[PDB]
């Protein structure tokens, strides 16, 4: 099996490995990439994996130590791939939400493919086909997502999690910035004043919460203002692993944006 750190990383892995081997994801649905510790049993899961795919030490802090017990030959460490490094964005220290970049997703898929071919040369033909099928899917999706978000150019929005920079830049979306907010408690008066001022001064169209946010949080932020409330899921909790899962994840995100922004 290929073991991926986070679910969308698993979506990319499962496209290349479909019909050759299994793909498992380490981070459970609902968990945060920034606040997690691996299970006691994951140690054996990593040792048995054919391949471990992760972003890198600036993203999955929960994997630094366990990954040092693995040869670099077993790893696809996306942030440190030669073709990924020139693609890294700041951030105004790079933004490490790489699985949201169709071009880094392609570089990731090439790396996975290269390595599975070495380990399973008998499955070369299937692996080659899976890479070709992944490219075809992703290019159709890029076209669809591009068409979807183009009429939304110029509509400014804020988000509560700075995870979307690679996606936004490729598809011409107008983010205004992000806010650092507690997902669990209602914002107090100060934080509400600072946010709502920006919402009004910058004439925001939307604020986007995330699934792990209890509804009353964003509702409190939006109260009074004419700003609409949306939801984005950067980890595609909703979507099941499989051949078409990465393309599905990107389309769902574009729909989430459009569902609030169209208007
Ligand atoms: Co994040």
UniProtKB/Swiss-Prot annotation:
Return the GO cellular component terms, semicolon-separated: ATP-binding cassette (ABC) transporter complex, substrate-binding subunit-containing; membrane; periplasmic space
UniProt keywords, alphabetically? Disulfide bond, Ion transport, Metal-binding, Periplasm, Signal, Transport, Zinc, Zinc transport
The record's section on Gene3D superfamilies has: Nitrogenase molybdenum iron protein domain (3.40.50.1980)
Q: Which cysteines are joined by disulfide bonds?
A: 206-260
- Output the Gene Ontology terms for molecular function: zinc ion binding
Q: Name one Pfam family in it.
A: ZnuA
Q: Signal: present as a keyword of the record?
A: yes
Q: CDD domains of this UniProt entry? A: ZnuA (cd01019)
Superkingdom of this entry's organism? Bacteria
One of its GO biological process terms is: cell adhesion
Q: What induces it?
A: Maximally induced 30 minutes under zinc-limiting conditions, still induced in stationary phase.
The record's subcellular location field reads: Periplasm
- Where on this chain does Zn(2+) bind? 33-34, 97, 161
Which InterPro entries would you find in this protein's record? Bact_metal-bind_prot9, Lipoprotein_PsaA-like, ZnuA, ZnuA-like
Q: Which family does it belong to?
A: Belongs to the bacterial solute-binding protein 9 family.
Record PANTHER family: HIGH-AFFINITY ZINC UPTAKE SYSTEM PROTEIN ZNUA (PTHR42953:SF3), HIGH-AFFINITY ZINC UPTAKE SYSTEM PROTEIN ZNUA-RELATED (PTHR42953)
Q: Which NCBIfam families match?
A: PRK09545.1
Q: What is this protein called?
A: High-affinity zinc uptake system protein ZnuA
Q: What gene does the UniProt entry assign to this protein?
A: znuA
